[PDB]
Amino acid sequence: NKDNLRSPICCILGHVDTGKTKLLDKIRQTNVQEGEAGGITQQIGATYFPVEAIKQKTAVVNKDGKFEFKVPGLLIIDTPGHESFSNLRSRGSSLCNIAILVVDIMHGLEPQTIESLRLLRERKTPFVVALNKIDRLYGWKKIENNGFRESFALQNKAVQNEFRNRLDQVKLQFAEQGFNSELFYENKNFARYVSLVPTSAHTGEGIPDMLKLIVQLCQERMASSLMYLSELQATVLEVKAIEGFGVTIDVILSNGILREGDRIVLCGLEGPIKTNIRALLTPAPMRELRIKGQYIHHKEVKAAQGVKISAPGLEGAIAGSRLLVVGPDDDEEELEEEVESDLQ
């Protein structure tokens, strides 16, 4: 039932500078990419999108309202594309239920695209491809934040032909890597063929189509049990000292529910850590966990979400550690053993 709905996790993967973060900024209406050193992402990011927002941002490709939204929302995990962060792509990939693979339409598949495809294939993750930077097609005429088809229909013949040529090349490339793919509105087998959705992070065109498609992936490809909450599952992303809270952990809550005051167990350098949540915090909706802000204090947070936890004794917490909650009925040492076993 609806009071037990789970917000799924989507990872965005792709080669360096293909526009992962720029796409998320266009959706959030933020400017994270401009603040990044080097213009590159160097850590895992997480942003929560309430379904009310996704409905608004897909309205132009859902004008009558026939599309049925079932998810309460979606957590999207941003990852680096730079060669040196494979550990982070592997982590993000292992957390997600679905994914967006970003491909620069002007370049096609590149080395970390291929790395990413290996990850998606290994976990059999449902994904869609954002064929990004369509505004670089020579003579592209934009309508800001339009659906791709509406905009494509208005282009001159030369632009349409250049588009089709590049799409055909990118399809042949996916085929060579063992994936069949179709332009999204030509895909007759959403269950087995990858949908390609042309986008521009600069003009916003196609982003409504991409958001609709990732909801569809959650609702029509992700295992249906993952639409509802079950046993708590959570992963430590980072251990960071924060002004006025001391040593905190950033955590991806993958399943279940966290509560203020909860007593939690996780791996530490010198052994398991057992402590109490003094503050259970999130960013504002549609704002990055990897960005400093005023944080929202919660008594309760439901999965999936990226959270920050303040608790004594977090020094020595180990990034990548699983995290568990000691409930009214629990035996602790068992839990310690299984997180310690999963760490190794």
Q: Which of residues 110-149 bind ligand GTP (CB under 6 A)?
A: 132-133, 135-136
Compute and round to an integer the Cα radius of gyration of the chain: 21
Q: Is 18 annotated as a binding residue?
A: yes
Q: Is 135 annotated as a binding residue?
A: yes
Which window, 38-46, 68-76, 233-241, 323-331, contacts ligand GTP (CB under 6 A)? 38-46
Q: Counting contacts by CB under 5 A, is residue 104 touching Na ion?
A: no
Nearer to ligand GTP, 202 or 298 (CB): 202
φ, ψ (nearest 5 deg) of residue 96: -90, 160
Q: How far is CA 78 from CA 81, 93, 100, 249, 274, in A?
A: 10, 10, 10, 18, 30
Nearer to ligand GTP, 150 or 260 (CB): 150
Distance CA 173, CA 196 (A): 13
DSSP code for 61: G
Distance CA 254, CA 232 (A): 7
238 binds, among Mg ion, Na ion, ligand GTP, none (CB under 5 to 8 A by kind): none
Q: Counting contacts by CB under 5 A, is residue 18 touching Mg ion?
A: no
Question: Which position has the token pair 């909860």?
Answer: 262
Which window, 37-45, 61-69, 147-155, 317-325, contacts Na ion (CB under 5 A)? 37-45
Contacts of 234 (CB under 8 A, 6+ apart): 251, 252, 253, 254, 255, 256, 258, 322, 323, 324
19 binds, among ligand GTP, Na ion, Mg ion, none (CB under 5 to 8 A by kind): ligand GTP
Half-sphere exposure of 338 (CA within 13 A, CB side): 10
Which window, 33-41, 49-57, 189-197, 219-227, contacts ligand GTP (CB under 6 A)? 33-41
Q: Is 40 annotated as a binding residue?
A: yes
Q: Which of residues 199-258 bind ligand GTP (CB under 6 A)?
A: 200-202
Q: Do the Cβ atoms of 101 and 115 come closer than 8 Å?
A: no
Q: How far is CA 334 from CA 291, 330, 338, 344, in A?
A: 35, 9, 6, 16
Q: Do the Cβ atoms of 127 and 99 come closer than 8 Å?
A: yes
Q: Which of residues 23-82 bind Mg ion (CB under 5 A)?
A: 41
Q: Is 201 annotated as a binding residue?
A: yes
DSSP code for 114: H
Q: Counting contacts by CB under 5 A, is residue 21 touching Mg ion?
A: yes
Among 17, 115, 209, 250, binds Na ion (CB under 5 A): 17
Size of the site for ligand GTP (CB under 6 A): 23
3-state secondary structure of 280: strand
Nearer to Na ion, 99 or 201 (CB): 201
DSSP percent split of the chain into helix, strand, coil, nearest 5: 35, 30, 40
Q: Is 202 annotated as a binding residue?
A: yes
Q: How far is CA 336 from CA 116, 199, 262, 276, 320, in A?
A: 32, 46, 16, 16, 15
Q: Is 134 annotated as a binding residue?
A: yes
Among 6, 8, 22, 74, binds ligand GTP (CB under 6 A): 22
Q: Counting contacts by CB under 5 A, is residue 25 touching Na ion?
A: no
CB of 45 to Na ion, least distance (A): 12
Among 5, 28, 30, 40, binds Na ion (CB under 5 A): 40
Q: How far is CA 278 from CA 36, 61, 182, 281, 291, in A?
A: 31, 43, 49, 10, 21
Q: Counting contacts by CB under 6 A, is residue 20 touching ligand GTP?
A: yes
Which window, 48-56, 65-73, 184-192, 197-205, contacts ligand GTP (CB under 6 A)? 197-205
Q: Counting contacts by CB under 5 A, is residue 78 touching Na ion?
A: no
Give the torsion sign (CA, 274, 278, 283, 284): positive
Nearer to ligand GTP, 82 or 221 (CB): 82
Residue ranges in contact with ligand GTP by CB under 6 A: 14, 16-22, 33, 39-41, 80-82, 102, 132-133, 135-136, 200-202
Binding residues for Na ion, per CB under 5 A?
17, 39-40
Binding-site annotation, residues for GTP: 17-22, 33, 39-41, 132-135, 201-202
